[PDB]
Design an enzyme around this catalytic site. Structure first.
Site: not given
Ligand SMILES: NC(=O)c1ccc[n+]([C@@H]2O[C@H](COP(=O)([O-])OP(=O)(O)OC[C@H]3O[C@@H](n4cnc5c(N)ncnc54)[C@H](O)[C@@H]3O)[C@@H](O)[C@H]2O)c1
Ligand SMILES: NC(=O)c1ccc[n+]([C@@H]2O[C@H](COP(=O)([O-])OP(=O)(O)OC[C@H]3O[C@@H](n4cnc5c(N)ncnc54)[C@H](O)[C@@H]3O)[C@@H](O)[C@H]2O)c1
Lengths: 504, 504
Positions: B237-238, B242, B259, B293
């Site tokens: 995610g963002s 994280g 990630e 991404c």
């Protein structure tokens, strides 16, 4: 018998360059002040981190086999000064002379191991699904490697991190324990000697600022962990330290190598070689006055063995020589300081409240109120109660009885730490079960060798509250580098237009 | 053309079992409600985590090749339902039909890869320095694997984590994005079908609770990350997500596979194949409406190429079909929601304030005020200013000119993210420099293939703010297991007494 100033002179340490009135360097042997030192300010620490980053930018393009040659030279410098450096470890960490020597030898051994790695640092070449493409995985120097180390292995922990980091193309910023600055100064001085020898044969290759030494209190430790120029921090110490460091690393999405506390146990099964057990238990529990992170603290003994085994361990315990670690014959030197002694005596008091029966553990008078020697303690416990789950960094061995092997495993695994572990048995079924997925939950899982059974070639570290980091052997070196996946298209073929207008 | 209820029926999803009035499942295609769903309470989430932990205790002793057979069967179930699951991905994530299909195919491919791994999971046998001892490194199932996934790859991210976790002996607790619950329900239902087929051939082997699905908002996401029974969390995610997850993991000393966001750039050097560049740039920048991404967001073009290359890219851009992703001919579907559209338009406004010249980027009316389609934007920027350093999850390609190759590398590396990267050149010296230690700082570093150039066999992930985690290929599987170093003493030799009384 070499006096303190003789040690400094043989190490070529000029104390005038390090003296001050901020940090007192004390010896656990007698509580005496060895020296009083200057410390880094937060701004000093930042400046050293900036210099290490500039050093990294140069070092990261030096071929790793060339980087390994500096580490090989460093290994030879350590060999030349092994006796004096070992003696300094004894004076500052309080361990007996042979363990002082043995700790320096660990530095030397990891240098030669890192020299081997300097011709490897293996990634992969990997099949690609794409025609006319090739794929590979490469490894690259990551940047400044921060090293935060504990008092009890004041030189080998740094060597383990620095040998690998240097070979991997990193610079190092070291903040040793404020309890053991003099051993760190010595290591730093010996590194400078290696750099001077290396400069003769490799002019202009190694940056002078490759290794940095930061001496001081929490304020500079916090500069190091918060620095955006330090992409990995290796932190060795208490669980609480590791939690705080990991929080700071997380906030800036940086990498941690966390090497935190242990609470290491041994299962003794019915078929165990008792002659072997009594020695392995005694040495792993009382060695270094119980101040190894792999120290044996929990003994889980099958009921059929208790009457035979425990009096033999008690007999060995009573015969252990507690005294000044400079004396031949001493096996157990002092605890590091009063706080350690007080925590030990508090643990024993808790043990008694929790139904334990304590033997040993009393203070041994050596004529100094600020030096803390104790007889190792062995405590018969009715269960693994709250005090046994705490890591008390002192020679206390808690003894629990078991009947069923599965239950012993559960008791072994029930503490929050997870560093090292051992089973003593001659039954291959129990040995394999202990090493299996449902066996010991620790990072080090041994059979018929105690909880300090580890060597350079193996990855060193633990699970659970021990923090998950690995140092030294296997592919631990990857934690000092960054992985890249590379796909290379050497085909001349154009992708399909998908109805998009690409024509000129 | 399969209607929504046809898709559910073909996937054997009974919506009555999932319906409620807490969570609205919306389609980006037209903004319409697909369904309204029940959600897990925090206590529900805890109960599912308890069940997954019980499942782990059973699964971790199942031979990994047997565990791989469940994953192989799961791969075949996905093959059988590929068309319908892909169509559901299109309806919920908004990507065109072929990318919906392609994403499901990634699930299938990782299953077969994990089947291969199920016969490996390699540790090491390692020389020991001790006579009559043997040393090895073994790998063990670690426990419940938490999976937190994003909206834009609503099925493949989970498959990447679950295929490896299951083969590695872990259970999985999945909390998908609240924006894409229906694809998660489908995956969970198809997994249940695999478990039923596997139960026929392997009675009693797989625990029914091996995979858990947790649907809901932040409250259950926070139960998952804080749970002391979940030793590893894979979080996609963002950057901000994280950071918050890593803080919670750190507090309990647990492992993260982070990630996070990318901001992926491409250097186009003077010798580049321009026919290839114009296609590679267009497809990597506008694909999935800039919601990968690995989407290309920064183009660093050598000055000698600008007049030739940029009109060709603009020509391709203008010809790209923006529209409903169910239509043949559509290349660019919608942005996920209004917040995404607003952030895109804000980024463009910032770009203009910062001297940029914008082409494209306007909204495309499809007759729905709550569906957001945009023309991809390409922005000539005088420098890589503040807006270019932000990850705006939308099709905006910022174009910067460079003269000197070293300067291009610095510009390429100057953003805080570090996921994927590419250089287009035919000069082997520039290609190797870009892949070298002083080149791209990213986790994926490609030559003559764009920033989405990655495949199953490679480790997938990035550096810097991308968070350092790796998924899928190489030895990424180790993040789902715990390492143990085992030393085995099979000698009968006693340690030296060191003057301690060991005699009976
Ligand atoms: N896992 C291993 O490899 C390993 C090895 C040796 C020792 N240990 C553990 O270390 C402990 C004993 O060492 P100690 O008493 O010196 O531990 P400690 O936690 O008190 O200190 C270790 C180091 O961390 C620094 N530090 C402490 N808090 C900090 C913070 N918030 N930010 C930055 N730096 C900080 C200290 O100054 C010192 O340099 C035991 O728990 C033992 O098990 C572990
Ligand atoms: N690195 C990769 O492999 C990868 C892959 C896909 C997407 N992405 C990134 O993901 C982003 C787009 O996805 P998104 O918009 O869904 O991101 P997001 O951060 O908004 O949400 C991702 C997931 O995290 C959950 N979440 C958010 N905050 C949380 C918290 N504090 N605790 C627990 N769970 C929390 C959300 O519910 C969702 O399931 C982009 O930045 C993109 O680059 C990265």
């Amino acid at each position: 018998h070499m006096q303190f100033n003789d040690i400094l002179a043989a190490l070529d340490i000029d104390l005038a360059q390090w003296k001050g009135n901020a940090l007192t360097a004390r010896s656990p042997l007698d509580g005496a002040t060895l020296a009083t030192l200057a410390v880094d300010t937060p701004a000093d620490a930042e400046r050293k981190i900036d210099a290490a980053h500039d050093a990294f930018l140069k070092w990261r393009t030096v071929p790793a086999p060339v980087r390994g040659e500096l580490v090989r030279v460093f290994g030879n410098v350590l060999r030349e000064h092994k006796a004096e450096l070992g003696r300094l470890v004894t004076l500052e960490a309080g361990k007996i002379t042979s363990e002082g020597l043995g700790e320096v030898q660990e530095m030397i051994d990891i240098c030669d191991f890192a020299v081997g790695l300097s011709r490897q640092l293996y990634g992969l070449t990997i099949a690609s699904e794409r025609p006319g493409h090739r794929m590979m995985e490469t490894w690259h120097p990551i940047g400044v490697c921060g090293v935060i180390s504990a008092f009890n292995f004041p030189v080998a922990v740094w060597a383990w991190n620095a040998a690998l980091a240097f070979v991997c193309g990193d610079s190092v910023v070291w903040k040793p324990s404020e309890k053991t600055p003099l051993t760190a100064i010595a290591c730093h001085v010996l590194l400078q000697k290696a750099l001077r020898e290396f400069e003769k044969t490799h002019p202009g290759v190694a940056p002078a600022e490759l290794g940095q030494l930061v001496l001081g209190m929490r304020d500079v430790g916090e500069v190091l962990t918060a620095s955006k120029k330090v992409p990995v921090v290796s932190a060795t110490g208490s669980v609480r330290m590791g939690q705080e460091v990991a929080k700071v690393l997380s906030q800036r999405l940086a990498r941690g190598i966390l090497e935190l506390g242990g609470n290491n146990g041994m299962i003794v099964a019915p078929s165990a070689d008792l002659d072997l057990v009594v020695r392995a238990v005694t040495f792993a529990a009382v060695g270094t006055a119980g101040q190894r992170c792999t120290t044996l603290r929990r003994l889980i003994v099958h009921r059929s063995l208790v009457e035979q085994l425990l009096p033999r361990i008690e007999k060995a315990y009573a015969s252990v020589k507690v005294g000044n670690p400079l004396e031949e014959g001493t096996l157990v030197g002092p605890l590091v300081d009063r706080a350690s002694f007080d925590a030990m005596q508090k643990a024993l008091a808790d043990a008694r409240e929790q139904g334990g029966e304590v033997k040993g553990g009393e203070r041994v008078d050596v004529g100094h109120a600020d030096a803390y020697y104790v007889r190792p303690a062995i405590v018969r416990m009715p269960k693994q109660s709250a005090v046994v789950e705490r890591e008390t960094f002192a020679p206390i061995l808690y003894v629990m009885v078991y009947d069923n092997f599965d239950d012993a495993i559960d008791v072994h695994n029930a503490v929050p730490q997870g560093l090292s572990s051992a089973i003593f048995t001659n039954d291959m079924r129990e040995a394999e079960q202990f090493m299996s997925a449902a066996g010991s939950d620790c990072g080090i899982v041994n059979v018929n060798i105690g909880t300090s059974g580890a060597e350079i070639g193996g990855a060193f570290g633990g699970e659970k509250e021990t923090g998950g980091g690995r140092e030294s052997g296997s592919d631990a070196w990857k934690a000092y580098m960054r992985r890249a996946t590379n796909t290379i298209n050497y085909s001349r073929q154009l992708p399909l237009a998908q109805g998009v207008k690409f024509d000129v």
